[PDB]
């Protein structure tokens with residue numbers, strides 16, 4: 001019978017970033033609709049309730065930057081958005097804008113970034129993978145089950161991936177079941193609100209730590225309750241009969 005206790009650990013790490021960039025603060029904008037061949041679907045589940053969950057689908061961004069270098073492109077730009085898809089509506093989860101990026105280097109080497117805009121509930125237990133293209137969730141509560149949509153924009157061109165998240169082991173004893181005032185994900189918006197430009201990022205989401213520190217803060221909380229961070233997160237499975 002495995003104990004359910006806090007454990008000693010070092011404070012959250014302060015990693016050195018990959019590179020120096022200018023952070024663009026206090027920007028807003030309408031988040032594009034997530035709706036409308038069809039979308040590549042993947043599946044993510046956890047064998048144990050206090051496991052880490054990954055949402056991983058290599059989007060082949062390496063090739064599309066290689067394509068741009070072959071056309072002598074001087075730069076590229078990018079936007080990464082996550083949503084929770086429900087009946088009729090979508091919750092915005094994550095927004096991140098990369099501008100003036102170098103295509104000869106690996107994705108993300110950009111002269112300008114916004115901070116990542118996060119849903120407040122989600123940011124307490126989840127952070128982007130190291131390549132900033134997937135998500136890691138640290139022992140999510142069962143209420144996290146659902147359909148998560150990733151939208152990758154390169155040079156204005158979007159590509160979508162869905163993740164069907166299934167959590168049959170239930171809550172973990174230390175899962176975060178709410179943020180302040182018990183709030184869970186933020187408001188679900190229907191397609192029309194997105195189209196009419198009402199889902200302003202600075203209004204519904206909050207600017208947050210870059211991936212290195214974000215991973216460090218959550219990993220610390222996760223580890224202090226006994227969790228082990230895996231050394232690798234494999235690609236999420238597709239549909240299998």
Ligand SMILES: *[C@@H]1O[C@H](CO)[C@@H](O[C@@H]2O[C@H](CO)[C@@H](O[C@@H]3O[C@H](CO)[C@@H](O)[C@H](O)[C@H]3NC(C)=O)[C@H](O)[C@H]2NC(C)=O)[C@H](O)[C@H]1NC(C)=O
Nearest residue numbers: 075076077078079096097098099100153154155156157158
């Ligand atoms: C990331 O870069 C994208 C392009 O690299 C930007 O999207 C492009 O913005 C252009 C404006 O500079 C659009 O302009 C088109 O060109 C003529 C002018 O010659 C206009 O009159 C047209 O009306 C206009 N056409 C269209 C189809 O809008 C580009 O078309 C547009 N291209 C794409 C593929 O979106 C993004 O704005 C930029 N993203 C960010 C966040 O800065």
Ligand SMILES: *[C@@H]1O[C@H](CO)[C@@H](O)[C@H](O)[C@H]1NC(C)=O
Nearest residue numbers: 015016017018019020021212
């Ligand atoms: C730029 O930042 C990198 C890491 O972020 C650091 O190693 C380097 O010393 C910095 N250089 C300057 C000139 O700021």
